[PDB]
């Protein structure tokens, strides 16, 4: 059905995403059990990590488009990512490595993430109809990799330890690199412009120098989230001043404020929703025992099923508003299940968490799939910078919000933790509902401005 390089790109993406979510699904639990962080410390550190992983995505597009070529940068990003996964597995021998290793993952992901997408865009004549089909199967690839990692990684860490989990993450990356290097001929005429002139070693050295610098700055900021807070605050207020100085752009600003709320909510799945499933949900579904941390797999799962269907079936403004209403309903379902549908011992049915993750995943399909692809319909380089800046801020604020559900290591009664989760999830849902009602009100004016 699809060109041959499509399958190569599909599987490089699948494997890289397996490594990434292999780390993401265990990281907060690893901060708590392995490094003996408290839950509040684990949550804010995860917030900083996520923020950097997302903020540095801007780099890899520029580096692939203009410095080294798309395919060279796929290779380089795979290599730096694998180094980072093995460094994280080495952190267990050498604990002081942890932040450097996470910085290596962030920078690695930054160089890599934008680039398979680019390459797949260049596998099709410019107005080939199969482009949308192919991009939905690419998102399904991302989400199959994420499904498998979020399901199996916690099981592996429990049965074999973390060094083995992180080394498998590296091995996934190494076989992504091997399948790329094997299928390299399939993409010999595909690439950006630097891909086809000889490689400039001056530029490669600037990229390696700057990568190393950023690894160290990442490690510093995740160790010291209070200066990360101020760096991002001042960066935000300054870039807001310079956006206001220089109204399709104003509609883009309102849409980014909406995406910020979405990412604060998205940030909860590996933190507060994760620990809610650990503390106040039954670890058994359909008669099978599961690792509760595996519950995160419910987000890619629902994506994998809902993306074909929803591709079968207002425009951008309503789709953003719809997605916000969905996210609101996910957190209101979580609060409801805690307030009224709980066992005398303080535990709830995992079907409520299946439904929470459905609502969340649908909000993701409506917003983050459908955002910068058509924020680019409203615009440039400065607003991509401001986008990635503000979404990294979103993830930092997400970690701070998650800390409202933090439980001290010495509480052991689920009836003590259940009111905390339900208060926070209920207020998150009420605020997101208000935000969505304002979005709905603004849909007509916004829809005029897009004309």
């Amino acid at each position, epitope marked *: 059905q699809q060109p041959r390089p499509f399958f190569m790109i599909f599987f490089v993406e699948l494997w890289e995403r397996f490594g990434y979510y292999g780390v993401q699904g265990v990281l907060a639990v690893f901060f708590v059990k392995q490094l003996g962080f408290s839950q509040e410390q684990a949550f804010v550190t995860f917030g900083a990590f996520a923020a950097l992983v997302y903020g540095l995505i801007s780099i890899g597009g520029y580096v692939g488009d203009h410095l080294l070529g798309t395919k060279r940068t796929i290779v380089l990003g795979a290599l730096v990512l694998a180094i980072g996964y093995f460094m994280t597995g080495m952190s267990l021998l050498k604990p002081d490595l942890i932040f450097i290793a996470l910085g290596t993952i962030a920078v690695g992901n930054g160089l890599f993430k934008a680039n398979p997408a680019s390459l797949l865009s260049k596998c099709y004549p410019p107005k080939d109809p199969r482009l949308d089909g192919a991009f939905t199967l690419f998102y399904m690839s991302i989400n199959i990799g994420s499904l498998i990692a979020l399901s199996l990684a916690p099981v592996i860490a429990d049965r074999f330890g973390y060094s083995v989990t992180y080394n498998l993450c590296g091995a996934g990356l190494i076989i992504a690199l091997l399948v790329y290097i094997a299928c390299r001929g399939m993409v010999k005429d595909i690439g950006s412009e630097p891909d086809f002139r000889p490689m400039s070693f001056s530029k490669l050295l600037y990229v390696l120098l700057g990568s190393v610098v950023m690894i160290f700055v990442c490690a510093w900021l995740m160790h010291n989230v209070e200066v990360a807070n101020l760096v991002l605050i001042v960066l935000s207020i300054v870039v807001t001043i310079i956006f206001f100085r220089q109204n399709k752009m104003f509609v883009a600003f309102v849409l980014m404020l909406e995406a910020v709320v979405f990412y604060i909510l998205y940030a909860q799945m590996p933190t507060s929703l994760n620990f809610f499933a650990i503390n106040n949900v039954h*670890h058994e579904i359909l008669g099978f*025992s599961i690792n509760p941390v595996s519950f995160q797999a419910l987000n890619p799962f629902w994506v994998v099923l809902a993306s074909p269907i929803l591709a079968g079936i207002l425009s951008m403004p309503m789709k953003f508003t719809l997605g916000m209403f969905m996210c609101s309903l996910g957190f209101l379902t979580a609060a409801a299940a805690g307030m009224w549908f709980a*066992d005398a011992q303080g535990l709830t049915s995992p079907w409520f968490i299946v439904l929470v993750y459905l609502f969340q995943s649908l909000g993701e399909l409506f917003i983050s799939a459908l955002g910068l692809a058509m924020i680019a319909a409203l615009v440039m380089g400065f607003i991509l910078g401001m986008w990635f800046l503000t979404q990294a801020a979103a993830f930092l604020l997400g970690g701070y919000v998650a800390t409202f559900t933090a439980v001290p290591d010495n509480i052991t009664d689920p009836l003590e933790t259940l009111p905390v989760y339900t208060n926070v999830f209920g207020k998150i849902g009420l605020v997101t509902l208000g935000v969505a009602v304002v979005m709905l009100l603004m849909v007509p004016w916004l829809k005029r401005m897009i004309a």
Partner: nanobody
Framework: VQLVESGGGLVQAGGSLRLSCAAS????????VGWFRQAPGKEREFVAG???????RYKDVVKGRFTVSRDNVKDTVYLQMNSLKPEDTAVYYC?????????????????WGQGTQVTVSS
């Protein structure tokens, strides 16, 4: 996923026993281990437990007499029972649940030992 209990037996009122629970496969380190007991003709009740980060929970009638502790090198959890009384006679089970919580009913726990008889004579 399967836990082995050792250490029960027969003891006179005022004596002491020590039970121990170990797991085969998963590291009990990630687990809240609770100890339940069933006396003849009653239901399993929660006795005493430790979570994955050393928080402890105790049924009121064993406070001051039983101690749960955890050896994270040997990957074993212990229940030290002192000042034993005849009303402590029961089948004792260990049970493991992932996480920091120790719920009170048996349905909160997925992994169960087979049981050790503990008898306390007058």
């Amino acid at each position: 996923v399967q836990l082995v209990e050792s250490g029960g037996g027969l003891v006179q009122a005022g004596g002491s026993l020590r039970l121990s629970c170990a797991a085969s496969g998963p590291t009990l380190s990630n687990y809240a281990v609770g100890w339940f007991r069933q006396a003849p003709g009653k239901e399993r009740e929660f006795v005493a437990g430790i979570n994955w980060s050393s928080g402890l929970r105790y049924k009121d009638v064993v406070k001051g007499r039983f101690t749960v502790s955890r050896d994270n090198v040997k990957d074993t959890v212990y229940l030290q029972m002192n000042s034993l009384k005849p009303e402590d006679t029961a089948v004792y089970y260990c049970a493991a649940r992932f996480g920091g919580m120790l719920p009170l009913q048996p349905s909160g726990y997925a992994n169960w030992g087979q049981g050790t008889q503990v008898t306390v004579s007058s």
